[PDB]
Amino acid sequence: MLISQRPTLSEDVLTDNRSQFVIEPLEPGFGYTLGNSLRRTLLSSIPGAAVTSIRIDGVLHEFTTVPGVKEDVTEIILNLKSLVVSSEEDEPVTMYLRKQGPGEVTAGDIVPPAGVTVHNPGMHIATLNDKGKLEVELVVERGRGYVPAVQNRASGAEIGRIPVDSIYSPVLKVTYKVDATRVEQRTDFDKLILDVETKNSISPRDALASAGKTLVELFGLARELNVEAEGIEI
Amino acid sequence: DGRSGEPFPYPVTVGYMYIMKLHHLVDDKIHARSTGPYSMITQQPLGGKAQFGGQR
DNA sequence: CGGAACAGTTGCGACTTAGACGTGGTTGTGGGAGCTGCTATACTCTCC
DNA sequence: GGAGAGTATAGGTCGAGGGTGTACCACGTCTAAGTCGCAACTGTTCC
RNA sequence: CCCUCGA
């Protein structure tokens, strides 16, 4: 009906991968109407690339230790789930990692197939003595949000294939708070604070813009029921 | 949860209870004074909200 | 932006008053209400 | 000399809204209200 | 002050 005071969006950049955003002032109650939907949208609605399953040559039935490697199996899994990757293929793509002799195995040693990018090459993966070698295959896909491991279990799954939890979401952590701002006589107005931390694939800005886009479409589904319908315009 | 839309995790006890509005009401209570009437006797401020007094 | 000359208002100062208001006297009887339903402690008085 | 008794003291803070008059007469003594005149006193109006 | 009431 009416036209409120136009709320503004502002950004304070905490680090390269972290930022705070404030939307303010909001008509009282709207901070919570935007808040959880914006957080869950930032988390679950942005597509990204992640490791799904891995093959490690030399481990088949019992997954405990890899001969010639200091890290055990599940720690290699932890180091791999933290690998930051982008993919244009939209279909699952396998990448390979092999290293021999003494030294440190890092994400930089991965040979990317055409159309994928490892953004954290210096990330420590494993460490090898002279007798050991690490031959490991990775199946990277695209998706949204965070899918657990059991959902990555193939019904025809190969022997030795280890499914992992996949973090597709380029944003790592999002929290939100609703404070009170004062507009003239009203001290109960809503101010929305979003603390959002992403990977180095995306900036917080572009993540917020993407979530806003897909939200505008989503509620556009409702707007389109009647385009004559009158609502708050500001 | 009306704010987040998420359901609360456990069943909460709900029902209908008979509630009364008691005769202690903010409108009769809130009082404040900068300066005001003083007692002619002790030359201290008066007291009570009706007299626009100060707090003891 | 002075100093008399001249003409309107309070305002103090009397006096009549009419009524409240306090004084004359005052002569058979005729002595209050209210309560006591607090506890505990220190210390002078006072009966012995 | 010394013991009971009789008397003295103390006993939470801050707030809100309410809350009072039997009883002599027949009178003089004074006062509580006055209307009403001159001074005394305010004001214009000049030259 | 008292009555009555709130913490």
Structure tokens at A2: 């009416």
- Residues A93-96: contacts with CB under 8 Å, at least 24 apart: A93/A139, A93/A140, A93/A141, A94/A137, A94/A138, A94/A139, A94/A140, A95/A137, A95/A138, A95/A140, A96/A135, A96/A136, A96/A137, A96/A138
Resolution limit, Å: 2.8
Structure tokens at A164: 């992992």
Structure tokens at A114: 């055409």
- Nearest CA-CA distance, residue B6 and chain A, Å: 9
Structure tokens at A157: 């799954």
Q: What does the alpha-carbon distance between residue A223 and residue A233 come to, in Å, rounded to a whole number?
A: 13
CA of B23 to C1' of C41 (A): 44
Locus of tokens 């900068």: B34
Most A CBs within 10 Å: which of B3, B6, B8, as the mutation test of the A interface?
B3
A63 touches chain B (CB under 8 A): no
Q: Is B27 (CB) below 7 Å from strand D?
A: no
3-state secondary structure (DSSP) of residue A67: coil
**Per-position b or e across A203-227, b if 16+ CB within 10 A of its CB:** bbeebbebbeeebeeeeeeeeeeee
The 8-class DSSP code of residue A40 comes to: H
Nucleotide nearest to B47 (CA to C1'): D15
Cβ–Cβ below 8 Å for A32 and B3: yes
Which structural technique was applied? X-ray
Architecture of domain A48-168: Beta Complex (2.170)
Q: What does the alpha-carbon distance between residue A226 and residue A220 come to, in Å, rounded to a whole number?
A: 10
3-state secondary structure (DSSP) of residue B28: helix
Architecture of domain A1-47+169-234: 2-Layer Sandwich (3.30)
* Strand A133-144, strand A103-106: pairing: unpaired
A34 touches chain B (CB under 8 A): no
Q: What does the alpha-carbon distance between residue A40 and residue A125 come to, in Å, rounded to a whole number?
A: 31
Structural domain boundaries in chain A: 1-47+169-234, 48-168
